[PDB]
Amino acid sequence: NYIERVVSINRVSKVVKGGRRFSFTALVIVGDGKGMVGVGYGKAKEVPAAIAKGVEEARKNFFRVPLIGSTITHPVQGEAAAGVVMLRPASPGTGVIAGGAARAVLECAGVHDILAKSLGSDNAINVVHATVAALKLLQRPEEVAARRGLPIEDVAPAGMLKARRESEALAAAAAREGSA
RNA sequence: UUUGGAGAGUUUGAUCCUGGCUCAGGACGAACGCUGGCGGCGUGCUUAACACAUGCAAGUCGAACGGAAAGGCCCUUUCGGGGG
Numbered sequence: 001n002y003i004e005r006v007v008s009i010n011r012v013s014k015v016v017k018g019g020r021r022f023s024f025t026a027l028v029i030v031g032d033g034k035g036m037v038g039v040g041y042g043k044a045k046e047v048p049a050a051i052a053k054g055v056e057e058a059r060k061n062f063f064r065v066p067l068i069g070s071t072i073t074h075p076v077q078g079e080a081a082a083g084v085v086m087l088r089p090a091s092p093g094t095g096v097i098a099g100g101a102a103r104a105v106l107e108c109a110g111v112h113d114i115l116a117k118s119l120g121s122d123n124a125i126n127v128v129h130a131t132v133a134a135l136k137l138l139q140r141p142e143e144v145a146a147r148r149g150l151p152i153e154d155v156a157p158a159g160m161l162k163a164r165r166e167s168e169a170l171a172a173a174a175a176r177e178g179s180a
Numbered sequence: 181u182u183u184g185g186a187g188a189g190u191u192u193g194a195u196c197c198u199g200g201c202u203c204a205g206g207a208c209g210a211a212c213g214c215u216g217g218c219g220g221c222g223u224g225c226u227u228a229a230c231a232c233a234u235g236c237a238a239g240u241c242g243a244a245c246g247g248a249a250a251g252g253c254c255c256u257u258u259c260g261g262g263g264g
Contacts, residue, residue: 013194020193082197091183099186117185123196159182 004055005029005104008124009047027124028054031108035065037135039128063132066140068160069167070112073141078134082121085130090114101127 008027013020024047030038038061042053066073075088085102090113096106098116101124106114118127145155152161 011194015193022194086185088185094184097184097186100188103186115185118187121197122187126196 001032002059003031003033003108004058005108006051006054007101007104012043024050026050026054027128028058029104029108029128030055030058030062031105031110033108033110035067035110036062037065037105037109037132038062039132041125063135065109065135066138067110068163069170070110071163072111072114073138073160076134076137078130078132078137080121080130080133081126083123083126083128083130084119084121085127085134086115086117086119087131087134088115099127100124102131105131 005028006026007029008025010025011022012025013022015021023043023045025041025043026047028040028042028051030036030040038058040054040057040061042050042055042057044050044053070092071089072087073089075086078085078087090097092113094113094115096103096111096114098106098114099118102116102118105128106116116131121127121130141152141156141160145152148155
């Protein structure tokens with residue numbers, strides 16, 4: 001199972017001596033709802049064709065996300081061509097607060113409680129690319145403790161670890177009610 | 181030692197960017213239109229500090245005083261009234 005999107009359809013036109021040889025584009029985002037996120041800019045004369053290209057290309061170019069239960073670690077600035085985005089964690093029960101593009105991205109990714117803001121380059125393309133850049137700038141605290149040699153306790157505060165423990169508890173609960 | 185930000189359209193054969201314009205939300209001591217069962221609590225000259233009829237809006241003390249017009253009591257009487 002995969003979640004899939006269609007969040008942009010423009011009607012493009014190369015121009016040639018006869019006239020306008022139109023074509024169709026699409027922007028497609030895929031996400032398992034758990035951390036996998038993929039992106040694709042498909043195009044064709046046919047809208048289903050472009051959509052299917054976007055689907056398969058997203059299924060190619062996944063990217064895993066440093067999540068915590070249902071929310072990100074830290075706020076971040078993501079730069080693309082000109083897409084600026086200021087993501088920032090929420091407190092649970094808040095909602096997937098964003099516009100159209102980033103909302104699609106994060107809802108497909110699996111986020112449920114997060115903030116966001118577009119500050120430049122309103123175009124969905126660059127907006128998505130900037131959001132992705134931000135998600136790449138993210139870091140897991142485990143990998144932070146790894147790269148700087150210290151342990152998680154000196155590396156993180158206590159509230160994040162509260163969240164870790166409680167979310168692991170809910171997850172083990174869900175899985176042990178499911179199978180066991 | 182913790183809490184809370186959403187965008188869409190628009191220049192172009194088509195694109196991206198800068199950049200402006202417009203829209204959705206909320207607030208009123210409000211007014212206009214259509215409609216108009218009730219109750220509770222609140223609220224009403226933002227303009228001409230323009231003019232003003234009319235009536236009430238700061239009086240009180242006889243345990244401060246001299247006194248005695250109406251009130252009251254008695255002396256009375258013609259009941260005219262007259263004295264305390």
